Design an enzyme around this catalytic site. Structure first.
Site, PDB file in Angstrom:
ATOM      1  N   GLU A 285      40.503  46.440  35.605  1.00 55.57           N
ATOM      2  CA  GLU A 285      39.689  46.424  36.824  1.00 55.57           C
ATOM      3  C   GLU A 285      38.407  45.601  36.698  1.00 55.57           C
ATOM      4  OE1 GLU A 285      39.161  50.489  37.948  1.00 55.57           O
ATOM      5  OE2 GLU A 285      38.009  51.089  36.179  1.00 55.57           O
TER       6      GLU A 285
ATOM      7  N   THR B 128      39.497  40.519  43.510  1.00 50.20           N
ATOM      8  CA  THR B 128      38.483  39.981  44.415  1.00 50.20           C
ATOM      9  C   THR B 128      38.384  38.464  44.299  1.00 50.20           C
ATOM     10  OG1 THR B 128      37.293  42.057  44.072  1.00 50.20           O
ATOM     11  CG2 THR B 128      36.131  40.294  45.226  1.00 50.20           C
TER      12      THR B 128
ATOM     13  N   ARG C 100      63.438  36.637  48.030  1.00 48.43           N
ATOM     14  CA  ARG C 100      62.946  36.351  46.689  1.00 48.43           C
ATOM     15  C   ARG C 100      62.373  37.610  46.051  1.00 48.43           C
ATOM     16  NH1 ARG C 100      60.249  31.099  44.766  1.00 48.43           N
ATOM     17  NH2 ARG C 100      60.505  30.549  46.971  1.00 48.43           N
TER      18      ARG C 100
ATOM     19  N   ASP D 100      47.852  34.577  37.146  1.00 50.41           N
ATOM     20  CA  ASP D 100      47.448  35.918  36.741  1.00 50.41           C
ATOM     21  C   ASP D 100      48.505  36.467  35.792  1.00 50.41           C
ATOM     22  OD1 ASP D 100      46.020  38.225  36.486  1.00 50.41           O
ATOM     23  OD2 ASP D 100      46.438  38.991  38.498  1.00 50.41           O
TER      24      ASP D 100
ATOM     25  N   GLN E  21      52.338  40.837  32.410  1.00 47.96           N
ATOM     26  CA  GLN E  21      52.826  40.714  31.041  1.00 47.96           C
ATOM     27  C   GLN E  21      51.930  41.526  30.113  1.00 47.96           C
ATOM     28  OE1 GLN E  21      55.630  38.985  29.844  1.00 47.96           O
ATOM     29  NE2 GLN E  21      56.178  38.879  32.017  1.00 47.96           N
TER      30      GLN E  21
HETATM   31  N1  LIG Z   1      31.826  47.971  44.943  1.00 41.69           N
HETATM   32  C1  LIG Z   1      32.388  46.847  44.456  1.00 41.69           C
HETATM   33  N2  LIG Z   1      33.653  46.865  44.038  1.00 41.69           N
HETATM   34  C2  LIG Z   1      34.233  45.720  43.537  1.00 41.69           C
HETATM   35  C3  LIG Z   1      33.492  44.503  43.460  1.00 41.69           C
HETATM   36  N3  LIG Z   1      34.284  43.572  42.947  1.00 41.69           N
HETATM   37  C4  LIG Z   1      35.474  44.162  42.706  1.00 41.69           C
HETATM   38  N4  LIG Z   1      35.473  45.428  43.047  1.00 41.69           N
HETATM   39  C5  LIG Z   1      36.588  46.337  42.916  1.00 41.69           C
HETATM   40  O1  LIG Z   1      37.026  46.352  41.560  1.00 41.69           O
HETATM   41  C6  LIG Z   1      38.426  46.716  41.529  1.00 41.69           C
HETATM   42  C7  LIG Z   1      39.170  45.865  40.521  1.00 41.69           C
HETATM   43  O2  LIG Z   1      40.565  46.078  40.656  1.00 41.69           O
HETATM   44  P1  LIG Z   1      41.606  44.874  40.188  1.00 41.69           P
HETATM   45  O3  LIG Z   1      42.756  44.839  41.106  1.00 41.69           O
HETATM   46  O4  LIG Z   1      40.860  43.517  40.192  1.00 41.69           O
HETATM   47  O5  LIG Z   1      42.129  45.196  38.704  1.00 41.69           O
HETATM   48  P2  LIG Z   1      43.075  44.384  37.643  1.00 41.69           P
HETATM   49  O6  LIG Z   1      42.221  43.918  36.444  1.00 41.69           O
HETATM   50  O7  LIG Z   1      44.204  45.312  37.145  1.00 41.69           O
HETATM   51  S1  LIG Z   1      43.839  42.889  38.515  1.00 41.69           S
HETATM   52  C8  LIG Z   1      38.867  46.348  42.984  1.00 41.69           C
HETATM   53  O8  LIG Z   1      39.430  47.488  43.640  1.00 41.69           O
HETATM   54  C9  LIG Z   1      37.583  45.933  43.663  1.00 41.69           C
HETATM   55  O9  LIG Z   1      37.499  46.545  44.955  1.00 41.69           O
HETATM   56  C10 LIG Z   1      32.095  44.485  43.922  1.00 41.69           C
HETATM   57  O10 LIG Z   1      31.373  43.526  43.907  1.00 41.69           O
HETATM   58  N5  LIG Z   1      31.652  45.693  44.393  1.00 41.69           N
END
Ligand SMILES: Nc1nc2c(ncn2[C@@H]2O[C@H](COP(=O)(O)OP(O)(O)=S)[C@@H](O)[C@H]2O)c(=O)[nH]1
Ligand SMILES: CC(C)CCC[C@@H](C)[C@H]1CC[C@H]2[C@@H]3CC=C4C[C@@H](O)CC[C@]4(C)[C@H]3CC[C@]12C
Ligand SMILES: CC(C)CCC[C@@H](C)[C@H]1CC[C@H]2[C@@H]3CC=C4C[C@@H](O)CC[C@]4(C)[C@H]3CC[C@]12C
Ligand SMILES: C=CCN1CC[C@]23c4c5ccc(O)c4O[C@H]2C(=O)CC[C@@]3(O)[C@H]1C5
Lengths: 286, 55, 344, 335
Positions: free
Chosen positions: C40, C45, C168, C190, C194
């Site tokens: 996360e 974003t 697909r 991305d 994996q």
């Molecule tokens: N309040 C606030 N929240 C944020 C901001 N930027 C990102 N997020 C949240 O951080 C989570 C990462 O989840 P993500 O899908 O990228 O994980 P992943 O590595 O498995 S791909 C997402 O739900 C975003 O809403 C910000 O500036 N402010």
């Protein structure tokens, strides 16, 4: 007494060094490194232009040594034709190489889809075609004349001799001197300013050393070209402007100007291929 | 769960029949010199029947 | 001496040579971005703020390929519902056996598809059989294909772009996003799916233009749920160390995105800054803390004389984030062109 | 608890393996004449790729092969006349496996997209289409092999192998048991078994029918990158990353012969056997293939000419060719 001997020796050494350098560049660029990059095509065509420009040197050296032209009419017809051809091919490939580097620096997005090998091929084909398009109007008019019981084959013009002659003189002067110095200075100056503004060459000792080396090896290119082509053009234009008394000094000065132009043709592979880092990488592998 | 199934898998790998190294190496070698006159890589075939030739 | 067969073979290979030529010259103009990030960190974003085009590309080539996939899925679904019927309705069963034989004998689209879209919708127990078939795992969009395919019967049917999406299979692992920005094309990958061993597919890139390594700023005082003994920013640092000191990525530029900026500004005022860095206690403000995080994150570049790192602080909208990516990418392109020109 | 029981009965297994060893393969082949030095030359260089080749499979007709690279192209070549019969535009550029059907009618590929795409090479339109995409894996597809026109076995990044059915797209059998990423599998000549190797430095043989592991082989220590059955199906060879090729065994279940040298410390990506089985060819990371004697454990020759790392290798079914694809967008066929 010995002026002819030393000018013949200097002609011989500049001819052999130029031919050996261009043959080494051709050998390396065919066998060791390939001809896939656009700059490799550019330096290949520059090597051919320099090798074919300096291959007429024994003919002129023995022409001065024997005081006459015993090689007939068609041989020096093609010699003066190929000299006018080769000066423009070498000059124009320098111009398009500097334009290539300027495009690769200041316009990177356009140089992604412009610096393709087929584009370099069509540019060089157009280059030799445009040099031929003014060397062939010299092919059909150069001829062998007789003066004072000796044979010389300077090119001869139509009934308004001065008009066409001076038209040729001012045209070759403006093109092959004003066109390369202006294009080269503006393109390399804009490139050097953009390299000064770019991040990867500023902010460290190694990065500033790299930037200073690039600026040094661009400024030496411009300086060698300007110094080696600069005495002959203005000397020819002042020979055509005002009459000059015949003296040993003017003959030696004329031959030294010729030697300086052919020294540019000889030193282009030294500062254009041997100083390229890809050729250095190829050299350190063996 | 995973440990017990690993135990039973490796214990059913335990009780299988095995012939000696000598017999298996011997008939592997016997297979080696039973097709030796057929393999083009060991003995280079003549270029007349070779389909990979310069044109 | 070669005749028509070898002449046609040479012509076809010349056509393949030309097609490879334009495809390679088109792929040379692209810019490959490798988007990394921890749990996360904010990769979603970054992806979703570049919403220009994502399904755009080779649209004509897409619609001319999966027709066999559509026919095979339809025949699989109908034989599955026939088998799930078992384990007044016999003429349509014979018709389904006939279209089964026709699909086994190819048959293209002229005859069998009209029958299979006509006879299935005449009955009323088909929906009940499909509902009974949900006990076992089957195709997720069988009836979806059935009720969104019967409207067209052309031999070369191009109904919608949604058909390409629904046929697909969604990629669980590598994810492709292709957006353009100021006459230059970007292809961002991305690798979140994996999750086995990154050491055997990081070499599969080996030459991407730039890395989009993302780090959340507010994970400095957070701890993982795995044994509650590992800091999240510390494992982000160790992942950055592994990426920087990598044999496949030894000269590529890494664009570090410090993403949770406003949450960092919320966390600094109530939480001490010494949890992540016990050896650091300089201030408590946002500017010095964020600058110290960036500085402690940029010294991981063990070869600073060749590799350049471009760090940007992005929080929510940041139209200039894509501009920062474009500036770093054009710097990399300038370096590559200088390498190509025998200058650098 | 039962961990000690597992340890002691694994001790029983390799004690039975040790008691089963009475003579090494070196001593049983200490009197046969060696192959000596063999020289092979590149008759065909298959130019036309523009990226990094990763996989190659030959054909049963011994004339057409297929290779995949990083440009999103799957080119079916021609070994005889050097002609590009087909070039499929892939929906996923990241692929490191390709397969060629025994009937010659189908070609497979896969990679980081978790998808084993199957292409029909002889459609009625004349071009190449996409027939079925095999979904159900959660890791990168490293090696796929066609059993027949209907079944295809795949090795994935999720440490499980899988046997598929083409017209249903469902794994009829799953081969679990690997504590590591399987990177290569080889089908048996009688298409009844297949053996796969993984990153846990172990190889496992599976039954296609009953779907359970029969033997395990823990000779290697680094990993397994390549594997290839013997022509008679009673042994196989394994590539790894500790600069060693190991010839394992089926009916005796040990490490028969070690093919290693103290100057070739790079890794191994590919292995294949000739028809006779006496010539084990292995691609390496030091830009050239080594040719090994499968009985004497000495190098016969070196297949140079690649300036980048050799990635894929294959000996044709009638033994008249050896194609080596490497990381320089070229293929090289040797005699
Ligand atoms: N309040 C606030 N929240 C944020 C901001 N930027 C990102 N997020 C949240 O951080 C989570 C990462 O989840 P993500 O899908 O990228 O994980 P992943 O590595 O498995 S791909 C997402 O739900 C975003 O809403 C910000 O500036 N402010
Ligand atoms: C011998 C003299 C007097 C005649 C004129 C020679 C001209 C026509 C020759 C000399 C150098 C040649 C070029 C040298 C190298 C290449 C690269 C090759 O991949 C395509 C052709 C191309 C671009 C050539 C085009 C023709 C060319 C320009
Ligand atoms: C531009 C700078 C760098 C160099 C200029 C060099 C040229 C223009 C100079 C160098 C040597 C000079 C010559 C030296 C000697 C004489 C003899 C005199 O009776 C007439 C002029 C004449 C023939 C000069 C003409 C101009 C000349 C050729
Ligand atoms: C250095 C040699 C280049 N040559 C090109 C042709 C020519 C030349 C040069 C410069 C200017 C000219 O107008 C000109 O025409 C010719 C001339 O009049 C004699 C001198 C040259 O052979 C020489 C340099």
């Amino acid at each position: 007494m010995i002026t002819a001997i030393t000018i013949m020796a200097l002609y011989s050494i500049v001819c052999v060094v130029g031919l050996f350098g261009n043959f080494l560049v051709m050998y390396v660029i065919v066998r060791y490194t390939k001809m896939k990059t656009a700059t490799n095509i550019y330096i290949f065509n520059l090597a051919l232009a320099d090798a074919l420009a300096t291959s007429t040197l024994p003919f002129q050296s023995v022409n001065y040594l024997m005081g006459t032209w015993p090689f007939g009419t068609i041989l020096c017809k093609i010699v003066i034709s190929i000299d006018y051809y080769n000066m423009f091919t070498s000059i124009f490939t320098l111009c398009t190489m500097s334009v290539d580097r300027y495009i690769a620096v200041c316009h990177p997005v356009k140089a992604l889809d412009f610096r393709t090998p087929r584009n370099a091929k069509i540019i060089n084909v157009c280059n030799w075609i445009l040099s031929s398009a003014i060397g062939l109007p010299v092919m059909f008019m150069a001829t062998t004349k007789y003066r004072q019981g000796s044979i010389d084959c300077t090119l001869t013009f139509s009934h308004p001799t001065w008009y066409w002659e001076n038209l040729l003189k001012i045209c070759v002067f403006i093109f092959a001197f004003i066109m390369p110095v202006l294009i080269i200075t503006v393109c390399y100056g804009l490139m050097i300013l953009r390299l000064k503004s770019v991040r990867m060459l500023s902010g460290s000792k190694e990065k500033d050393r790299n930037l200073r080396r690039i600026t040094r090896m661009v400024l030496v290119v411009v300086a060698v070209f300007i110094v080696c082509w600069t005495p002959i053009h203005i000397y020819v234009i002042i020979k055509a402007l005002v009459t000059i008394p015949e003296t040993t000094f003017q003959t030696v000065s004329w031959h030294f100007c010729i030697a300086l132009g052919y020294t540019n043709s000889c030193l282009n592979p030294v500062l254009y291929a041997f100083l390229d880092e890809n050729f250095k990488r190829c050299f350190r592998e063996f | 769960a995973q440990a017990r199934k690993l135990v039973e898998q490796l214990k059913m790998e335990a009780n299988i029949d095995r012939i000696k190294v000598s017999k298996a190496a011997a008939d592997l070698m016997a297979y080696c010199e039973a097709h030796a006159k057929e393999d083009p890589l060991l003995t280079p075939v003549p270029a007349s029947e070779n389909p990979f030739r310069e044109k | 001496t070669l005749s028509a067969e070898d002449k046609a073979a040479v012509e076809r290979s010349k056509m393949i040579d030309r097609n490879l030529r334009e495809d390679g010259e088109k792929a040379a103009r692209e810019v490959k971005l490798l988007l990394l990030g921890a749990g996360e960190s904010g990769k979603s974003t970054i992806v979703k703020q570049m919403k220009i085009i994502h399904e755009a590309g080779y649209s004509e080539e897409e619609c001319k390929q999966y027709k066999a996939v559509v026919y095979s899925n339809t025949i699989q679904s109908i034989i599955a519902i026939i088998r799930a019927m078992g384990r007044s309705a016999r003429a349509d069963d014979a018709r389904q056996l006939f279209v089964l034989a026709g699909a086994a004998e190819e048959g293209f689209m002229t005859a069998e598809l009209a029958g299979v879209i006509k006879r299935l919708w005449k009955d009323s127990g088909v929906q009940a059989c499909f509902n009974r078939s949900r006990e076992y795992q089957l195709n997720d969009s069988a009836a979806y294909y059935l009720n969104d395919l019967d409207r067209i019967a052309q031999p070369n049917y191009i109904p919608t772009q949604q058909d390409v999406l629904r046929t697909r299979v969604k990629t669980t692992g590598i994810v492709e996003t292709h957006f353009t920005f100021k006459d230059l094309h970007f292809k961002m990958f991305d690798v979140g799916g994996q999750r086995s061993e990154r050491k055997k597919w990081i070499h599969c890139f080996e030459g991407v233009t730039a890395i989009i390594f993302c780090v959340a700023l507010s994970d400095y005082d957070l701890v993982l749920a795995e044994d509650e003994e590992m800091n999240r920013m510390h494992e982000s640092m160790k992942l950055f160390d592994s990426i920087c000191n990598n044999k496949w990525f030894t000269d590529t530029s890494i664009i570090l995105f410090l993403n949770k900026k406003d949450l960092f500004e919320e966390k600094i005022k109530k939480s001490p800054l010494t949890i992540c860095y016990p050896e650091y206690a300089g201030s408590n403000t946002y500017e010095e803390a964020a600058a110290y995080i960036q500085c402690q994150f940029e010294d991981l570049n063990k070869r600073k004389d060749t590799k350049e790192i471009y760090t940007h602080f992005t929080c929510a909208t940041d139209t200039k984030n894509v501009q920062f990516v474009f500036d770093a990418v054009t710097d990399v392109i300038i370096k590559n062109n200088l390498k190509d020109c025998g200058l650098f | 608890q039962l961990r000690q029981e597992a340890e002691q009965l694994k001790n029983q297994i390799r004690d039975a393996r040790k008691a089963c060893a009475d003579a090494t393969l070196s001593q049983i082949t200490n009197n046969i004449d060696p192959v000596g030095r063999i020289q092979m030359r590149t008759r065909r260089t298959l130019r036309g790729h523009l990226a990094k080749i990763y996989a190659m499979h030959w054909g049963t007709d011994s004339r057409l092969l297929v290779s995949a690279s990083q440009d999103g192209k799957l080119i079916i070549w021609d070994s005889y006349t050097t002609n590009k019969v087909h070039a499929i535009p892939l929906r996923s550029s990241w692929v490191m496996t390709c397969a060629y059907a025994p009937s010659g009618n189908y070609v497979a590929c896969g990679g980081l997209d978790n998808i084993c795409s199957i292409y029909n090479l002889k459609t009625r339109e004349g071009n190449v289409r996409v027939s079925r995409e095999l979904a159900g894996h959660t890791g990168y597809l490293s090696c796929c092999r066609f059993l027949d026109d209907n079944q295809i076995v795949t090795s994935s990044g999720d440490t499980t192998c899988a046997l598929w059915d083409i017209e249903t797209g469902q794994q009829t059998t799953t081969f679990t048991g690997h504590t590591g990423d399987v990177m290569s599998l080889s089908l048996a000549p009688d298409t009844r078994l297949f053996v796969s190797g993984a990153c846990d430095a172990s190889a496992k043989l599976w039954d296609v029918r009953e779907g359970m592991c029969r033997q395990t082989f823990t000779g290697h220590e680094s990993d397994i990158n390549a594997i290839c059955f013997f022509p008679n199906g009673n042994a196989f060879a394994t590539g790894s990353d500790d600069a060693t090729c190991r010839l394992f065994d089926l009916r005796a279940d040990q490490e028969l012969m070690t093919y290693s040298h103290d100057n070739i410390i790079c890794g191994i990506t590919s292995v294949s056997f000739s028809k006779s089985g006496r010539l084990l060819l292995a691609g390496y990371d030091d830009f050239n293939c080594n040719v090994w004697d499968a009985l004497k454990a000495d190098r016969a020759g070196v297949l140079a000419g690649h300036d980048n790392r050799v990635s894929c290798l294959g000996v044709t079914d009638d033994g008249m060719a050896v194609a080596t694809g490497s990381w320089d967008s070229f293929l090289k066929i040797w005699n």
